[PDB]
Amino acid sequence: ARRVAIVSAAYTPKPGSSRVRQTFKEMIVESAYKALKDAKMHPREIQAVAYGYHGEGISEYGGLGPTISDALGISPAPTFMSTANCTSSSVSFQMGHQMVASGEYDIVLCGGFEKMTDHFNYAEYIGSSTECEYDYFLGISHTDAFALATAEYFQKFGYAGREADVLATFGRQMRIYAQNTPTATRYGQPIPSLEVLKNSEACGSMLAWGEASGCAILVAEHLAHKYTDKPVFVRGCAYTGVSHYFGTRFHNPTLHHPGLPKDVGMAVSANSIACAEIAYKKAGITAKDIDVAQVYDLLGAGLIQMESMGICGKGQAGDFVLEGGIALDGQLPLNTDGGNIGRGHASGCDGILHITELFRQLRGESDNQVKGARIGVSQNLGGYAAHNSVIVLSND
Amino acid sequence: RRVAIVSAAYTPKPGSSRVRQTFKEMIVESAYKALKDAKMHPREIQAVAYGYHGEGISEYGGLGPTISDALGISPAPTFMSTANCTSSSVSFQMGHQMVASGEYDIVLCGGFEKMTDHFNYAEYIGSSTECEYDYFLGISHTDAFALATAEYFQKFGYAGREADVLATFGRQMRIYAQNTPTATRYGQPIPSLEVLKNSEACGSMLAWGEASGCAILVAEHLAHKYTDKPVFVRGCAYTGVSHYFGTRFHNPTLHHPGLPKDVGMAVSANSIACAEIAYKKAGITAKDIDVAQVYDLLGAGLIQMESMGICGKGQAGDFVLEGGIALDGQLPLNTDGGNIGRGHASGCDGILHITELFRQLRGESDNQVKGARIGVSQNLGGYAAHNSVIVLSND
Amino acid sequence: SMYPEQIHRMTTASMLREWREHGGKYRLEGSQCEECNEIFFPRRTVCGACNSLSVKPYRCARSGKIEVMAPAENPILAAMGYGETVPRIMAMVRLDDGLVIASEIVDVCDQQQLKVGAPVRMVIRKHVRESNLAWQYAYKFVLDI
Amino acid sequence: SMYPEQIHRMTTASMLREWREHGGKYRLEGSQCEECNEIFFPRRTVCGACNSLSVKPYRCARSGKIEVMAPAENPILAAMGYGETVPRIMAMVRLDDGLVIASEIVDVCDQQQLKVGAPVRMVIRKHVRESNLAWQYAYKFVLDI
Amino acid sequence: KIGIVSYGAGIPVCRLKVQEVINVWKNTDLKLVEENLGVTERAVLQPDEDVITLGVLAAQRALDKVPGHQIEALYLGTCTNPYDSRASASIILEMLGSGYDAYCADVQFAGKSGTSALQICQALVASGMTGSALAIGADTINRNTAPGDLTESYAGAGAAALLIGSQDVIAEFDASFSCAADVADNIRPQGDRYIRSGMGLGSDKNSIGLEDQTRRAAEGLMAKLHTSPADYDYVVFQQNLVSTPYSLAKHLGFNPKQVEPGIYAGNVGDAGSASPLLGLINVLDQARPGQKILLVSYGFGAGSDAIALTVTDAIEQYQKHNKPLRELLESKIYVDYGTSIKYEFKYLRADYALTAYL
Amino acid sequence: KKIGIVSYGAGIPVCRLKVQEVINVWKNTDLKLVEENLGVTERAVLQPDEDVITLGVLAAQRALDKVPGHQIEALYLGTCTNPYDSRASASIILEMLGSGYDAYCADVQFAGKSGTSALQICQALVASGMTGSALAIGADTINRNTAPGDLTESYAGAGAAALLIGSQDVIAEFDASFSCAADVADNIRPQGDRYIRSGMGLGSDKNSIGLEDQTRRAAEGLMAKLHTSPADYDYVVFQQNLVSTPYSLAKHLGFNPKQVEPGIYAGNVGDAGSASPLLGLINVLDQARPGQKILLVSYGFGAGSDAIALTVTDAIEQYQKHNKPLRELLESKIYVDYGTSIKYEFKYLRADYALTAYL
Amino acid sequence: SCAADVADNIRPQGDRYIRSGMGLGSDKNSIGLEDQTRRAAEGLMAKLHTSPADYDYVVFQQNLVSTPYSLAKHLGFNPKQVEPGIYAGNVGDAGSASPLLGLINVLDQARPGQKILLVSYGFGAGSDAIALTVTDAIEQYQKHNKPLRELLESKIYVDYGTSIKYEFKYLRADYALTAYL
Ligand SMILES: Oc1cc(O)cc(O)c1
Ligand SMILES: [Zn+2]
Ligand SMILES: [Zn+2]
Secondary structure (H helix, E strand, O other), rough: OOOEEEEEEEEEOOOOOOOOOHHHHHHHHHHHHHHHHOOOOHHHOOOOOEEEEEOOOOOOOOOOOOHHHHHOOOOOOEEEEEEEHHHHHHHHHHHHHHHHHOOOOOOOEEEEEEOOOHHHOOOHHHEEEOOOHHHHHHHHHHHHHHHHHHHHHHOOOOOOOHHHHHHHHHHHHHHHHOOOOOOOOOOOOOOOOOOHHHHHHHOOOOEEEEEEEEEEEEEEEHHHHHHHHOOEEEEEEEEEOOOOEEEEEEEEOOOOOOOOOOOOOOEEHHHHHHHHHHHHHHHHOHHHOOEEOOOOOOOOOHHHHHOOOOOOOOOOHHHHHHHHOOOOOOOOOEEOOOOHOOOOEOHHHHHHHHHHHHHHHHHHHHHOHHHHOEEEEEEEOOOOOEEEEEEEEEOO | OOOOEEEEEOOOOOOOOOOOOOOHHHHHHHHHHHHHOOOOOOOOOOOOEEOOOOOOOOOOOHHHHOOOOOOOOOOOEEEEOOHHHHHHHHHHHHHHHHOOOOOOEEEEEEEEOOOEOOOOOHHHHOOOOOOOHOOOOOOOOOHHHHHHHHHHHOOOOOOOOOOHHHHHHHHHHHHHHOOOOOOOOOOOOOOOOOHHOOOOOHHOOOOEOOEEEEEEEEHHHHHOOOOOOOOOEEEEEEOOOOHHHHHOOOOOOOOOOOOOOOOOOOOOHHHHHHHHHHHHHHHOOOOOEEEEEEEOOOHHHHHHHHOOOOOOOOHHHHHHHOOOOOOOOOOEEEOOOOHHHOOEEHHHHHHHHHHHHHHHOOOOOOOOOOOOOEEEEEEEEEOOOOEEEEEEEEE | OOOOOOOOOOOEEOOHHHOOOOOHHHHEEEEEEEEOOOOEEOOOOOOOOOOOOOOOEEEEEEEEEEEEEEEEEEEEHHHOOOOOOOEEEEEEEEEEEOOOEEEEOOOOOOOHHHHOOOOEEEEEEEEOOOOOOOOOOOOEEOOOO | OOOOOOOOOOOOOHHHHHHOHHHHHHEEEEEEEEOOOOOOOOOOOOOOOOOOOOEEEEEOOEEEEEEEEEEOOOOOOOOOOOOOOOOOEEEEEEEEEOOOEEEEEOOOOOOOOOOOOOEEEEEEEEEEEEEOOOOOEEHHHHHHH | OOEEEEEEEEEEEEEEEEHHHHHHHHHHHHHHOOOOOOOOOOEEEEOOHHHHHHHHHHHHHHHHOOOOOOOEEEEEEOOOOOOOOOHHHHHHHHOOOOOOOOOEEEEEEOEHHHHHHHHHHHHHHHHOOOOOEEEEEEEEEOOOOOOOOOHHHHHEEEEEEEEEOOOOOOOOEEEEEEEEEOOOOOEEEEEOOOOEEEOOOOHHHHHHHHHHHHHHHHHHHHHHOOOOOHHHEOOOOOOOHHHHHHHHHHHHHHOOHHHHHHHOOOOEEOOHHHHHHHHHHHOOOOOOOOOOOEEEEEEEOEEEEEEEEEEEEHHHHHHOOOOOHHHHOOOOEEHHHHHHHHHHOOOOOOOOOOOOOO | OOOEEEEEEEEOOOEEHHHHHHHHHOOOOOOOHHHHOOOEEEEEEEEOOOOEEEEHEEEEEEHHOOOOOOOOOOEEEEEOOOOOOOHHHHHHHHHOOOOOOOOOEEEEOOOHHHHHHHHHHHHHHHHHOOOOEEEEEEEOOOOOOOOOOOOHHHHHHHHHHHHHHHOOOEEEEEEEEEEOOOOOEEEEEEEOOOOOEEOOOOOOOHHHHHHHHHHHHHHHHHHHHHHHHHHHHOOOOOOOOOHHHHHHHHHHHHHOOOHHHHHOOOOOOOOOOOHHHHHHHHHHOOOOOOOOEEEEEEEEEEEEEEEEEEEEHHHHHHHHHOOOOOHHHHHOOOEOOOOHHHOOOOOOOOOOOOOOOOO | EOOOOOOOOEEOOOOOEEEEOOOOOHHHHHHHHHHHHHHHHHHHHHOOOOOOOOEEEEEEEOOOOOHHHHHHHHHOOHHHHHHHHHHHHHOOOOOOHHHHHHHHHHOOOOOOOOOEEEEEOOOEEEEEEEEEEEEOOHHHHHHHOOEEEEEEEOOOOOOOHHHHHHHEEEEEOOOOOOOOO
């Protein structure tokens, strides 16, 4: 039960931009060897790796563990794989933390990647990670769930007449964060006006698809002094899983948790509340301790996560976003690197993208820096809350 | 801290197909049978480490939460492992770290393979290599083992005894499986040696089937509530090497001291390295081993016994010919019948090894090694692309 | 076509998958527990609430109302076999027995009639063709008006 | 066919995969490290021995000897696109530079000449057709006498 | 006393105005098709509809009148069958979930497949081999009609299911008479998607096939029953067009009052095997007890089925709570010719589709 | 009065192709497996000028020749390899027989059980008194609709059988029947496809979900209706795509091999499709004595099954006194190589539009 | 070079098989094979002011072994000028390679200074005529070279069933579930 610290974290820049020239093996080496350089450590010093991608159906490449190890040239160091939608990296990070905390491995590398251009149309493939017999094979995409989830939230929480404004305000705030973050895909672009964003596609809340690989180096606490001046520790993390089927959100007898709201729906993610409550208790903090956070953003799905994370009351996330509360001077800065709207989004690499910005935030290195930040939390979901990962990081 | 296995079970006759039940039903069967053996309620599980070949078989991806909901343990997390034949071997090592880290006290570890959901599962198998330079070129895993067998017998002067060695190894699996109730080849008559030499693959061909298996890992101090005789984990090692079959002969990427200069397919450099790391971690040498489990297919069993340190380079054939892997032999091998007799589901194979060793260390195996205090599982994925060595002792 | 050269395909679906799911997709069959009478859909082997192995097939209510709906008009997200009909009306249907089914609404005679909470009934329709050339049939929902 | 209904297919290969691998598959290009002068195949970004990112492409020797061979005669293990030629002769080819390639032998004019250590040369042949309808060509080996 | 216990129908909602087809192809006169033939619009099959989809709907609607019915026999009558080997009636039986132990087969004889299957079910119940039986006549003529064909403007689809039993009969089965011959007026060889004509469309083609077999079957049944056209309150013919029953009536000695109740295809078109059965439904929907009905259907490659019915007094209690066929035909969606060709998969698209729009 | 089979006739192609000829070309299966376990040493080849209607009318005419001056009241053709997808092929055979125009006519299709399904329909017509007699035909050209290189190509054949149901001079009484069905797409052919396709890999797993289940359900269902056990019946007749299949089903259902052997015929014919259960009944009827009880159970994929029980009447002795046995008809055979067989059955990929015969 | 619109053999777009515009025979040869070949050869010789007797070797289209000899007899070339170029006795119609493969077999035995006349025929219809002179460098070239004839000795025999199978001439399923299903 020893402490684990993050000595380094890096990912390929512009994750919302495709990297059609390099193979996924080239892409993975790039992010890892840049992170190893930051930690002043040799690649041979890694004793094992926990990596993650969507599944063998994209690049038609299965059992990827040994190929990753050989690609990095750390053979015979093992590589542990995780295939869990957008939380593939978040689960790979949690796996690596358990590998170092167990004392079986002293230095581990945890990352995720998504090389979507290897598939002709990657958007059709995505649905293969659900209750495929009753949704994928029926023509139900993952984007459908987020579209319906956004609809139920606005409709049952009295946001009629303000739906376009809330989505555009969140999307605009993501552009503002991403304009000055050099690793963001929307970096350097002008900020569209609020009225322009409401007329754009998905009212400005559509994410930027792309490709990226990222990784973070975890080391035992006593070994951390050799590799980093300012280490970031892991207070606590939780991972939870419920049925992939979208219908079970409203009716979930399998899920067992206390205090869950009676009116569970797509707008009120029951699994997301459970995962947050487990992680907070395990990390020894309440929601009032978070100085900066990172959530999965797509249409109104960001609003649902803020309420499940305890940032604001049920039905209040929209008004919170409208009041500039997730701005840098707002009550809680949210997705300070630009999020999936501005930074970009690769499903396999999403978890590391969250840790990296939180990692930079707790070391004062973020481009939009929360003054005196001590606690950083990453909220991530796979599928539609079928997976859910909440990770808590502190700087001291 | 120490972890102990309180129960381990798998669906019977893994070499025979279960076309009537879905893979969810199949996973639940082994899981809830294992819970009954350990006198523990299903809601007591805090996390799961399961494994399957890949999302391409049943077209089911992101399987973690589906497993948790299938078992009815939500919101308990399920950590997925997709690493060829060692999917269960890798997943067991994942659960060991979850319990040893202290983040979870009770963890269920297993694997499954539902091959009948794919029209032709065999042609899909190659999807887990260096796909661009073997899968897309028509080179399957089965091609690798056939070549490796050919190099072994040819490099070590076994010419003229190849059919005898494979049939002697194959027939020993048939004899072991006949009295093992859960084996697929259970209760069948023993074919003659000469009949096996003229049969397909000289009698060393394994039995393709489907099965789900699982084993319960618990922290040492909690183990006494669930079982009277727990089995501990001395040490485990996992190693990764290039999927490409040509790299066995020439692999400067693999950095491990003391490797023989004649590395090839007949001498697995990765399997030697993995065995040495596990033996050091468990604090035991090869002479300590009382019973073992290998991935048996063609002559791949012979190569694995040598890489495991049981016999010198080239002795396995003569070792098997001298009846060494028999119950009265110096070291019994695959006492449940192995892949030839018990059967094999690729994702489920790691638990199939652990269950027999788990049963052997508790004196419960049908072909029982008297006084076995240690058991070792050798498992490989691809052609030694993965290699997993887990050491279990009862003291 | 004219050159019968086999084309590479990783995954070919066996008839067994849909064969086991004929009850679920054709007749909207879920599962009900014998101890606590809790109902689920899709079918499951283990009860969720009381965690009993004793679970039996259950015919879900074929009538229901729309809990939430969202049109699918984006051509980038058009899936093979479903690109002919634009736009597809995705909706979560709260059946009469309380269960919620994720499906789509078809045969919208009156655009004004379709709204949140409108009554619908289950129908059987054609879906994407199987990888083994067999026609796939499964449920959809139409407005019950 | 005469009914142009889309048929389900989970994976459709992008042309990018084979495009980046033309050097490896058409020209048998591996990788050579500049600092320590070690060569590998297939191509790689990181050198294995010295761990330097300074790596360059390398044209492997297209001649070699048969290190080990095994016929593939089993129809159960026949793969799509490769079922027309029976039996396919699988072989590990030790190139003249010391590297080992896994491929097959074709155009066996004299059966007696096919034995271990026989000299072979690389040739370009047609392989399984791509998921994107593009023909696929890659290397094979024939006896070099 | 064995006859029809209940019935149900299935119609596609999408409609294509006849003028749309003429403006593209310009292959026939609009006045002739609208006024002489009597079809102003036809039903368009959606991408997710076929014989089984419409068929199981009509079957489910018939069985909903008899709750908890156990299926003892199910015969699917169709010439546009989705499977050339294996029976689709097995799939419909599975979808109904009313039991597996049942007589099941696919009956096919062009437009008389629906009635021919009705004769099967009648024989099973009358012979005591089953206690009840389900007959389904369905066809997707629009799917199997080539673009540019003269009959494209009025090719439609539909399904009709009638449950035969001895308990609570609403229309008795008095007797039947059937005939056949080798008259290749319309043929679809094996493997062909589209039904083709054996000769030019016209009165000459109707006299040798449609009118010949219909007259022989109708006469054959009437002579067996010693009845004349004046004894029947309604007559129901094959109804590929609205003109066909009226034209057949004048040829057979029936008055227009006897045909009009069966006319339904003004906005549907050629429904294939279902047209004689859908016409019977439109008649049974407003019939009074005691009235006599004569149904004669025509299937090409020719033969004909003649069936005589008597409406029982139980028809009153049946119609009290039921939706008539005329009301079902009110629900319609309109599409242009471009959409109709896309829905019915009549664009020449690539054999192997990489993505849906590529 | 008792209603049952009055006469029967069969039509089988004369061309034969040794199984070894197919294996040598494709090398896709073990020769010992097909010849010894499966029991097919050679299969029937379809000439260019014969098909379902050719064999059907030949089988139909041969049965009507036993009853001179007969008038056809109903004719049903049961086949899954139908030459016409629209219009009834049975109407053509009716015209060819020239025994009457006024007859109940249709095409019945349900895979291998189309023959018995048509037999059941003819029985219902006569027993219900809707007709005085009825003619049922089970025919198929499986070899024509089996692709080259298919695993089942080596034992794919063709054949036709016809049975006359009547109430006068019955040689085999129709006691009772039982049928079941389900959606089990073990083998399927969609509309427009020429070749029958499999739903999964061949094996005992594929057999257990379709062939074994539907045959068992139908058999046990019928025997429970009559309250009889396997020991009551003198002969049993199953689907006979392979010689192994009737034996395997008997072992599964509890019939000793002696009840199966009289029905075996397809050692040199291969899979005869819808005619295989009827052809097996014909070889039984050629040698049966009066009083013997016959149990016939058929199988059609996309699965359903038909079970029918018969009793042999005293008229059988007069019938076979001047009759050509099917076994005698199976001796007439012409052998072709694989090249000719592919040419005869139109399996060469030839030009869509042919200017001349060889151009 | 010369050309015209003579549809003696055509393959329309989307057709796999080459089709004949008329029945095979000497009449079909005169309007296409014989006309265009004569026109191109006579046109070239008139440009070079040479006669058939000046060339040591002549190379024609070699769909068949008979075609160059018959064309030579027609155009006035004695057999010895043709025989060196013949190779297709065991190959068949090699298509576009037949004039080039004939030249290779000639160059394998040619001496410096010898004159070669190559006239090829492509249906549809057209003919290309090319005249060559052998340089002194051929002697050095042939010192280390595998001749065409030696390469043509390597062959593997198959029956008709396999040949049809190898070339995908069986009418198989459009969509193949497995290799043999
Ligand atoms: O698995 C995924 C789900 C989703 O909604 C988006 C995406 O890019 C991947
Ligand atoms: Zn319960
Ligand atoms: Zn180097």
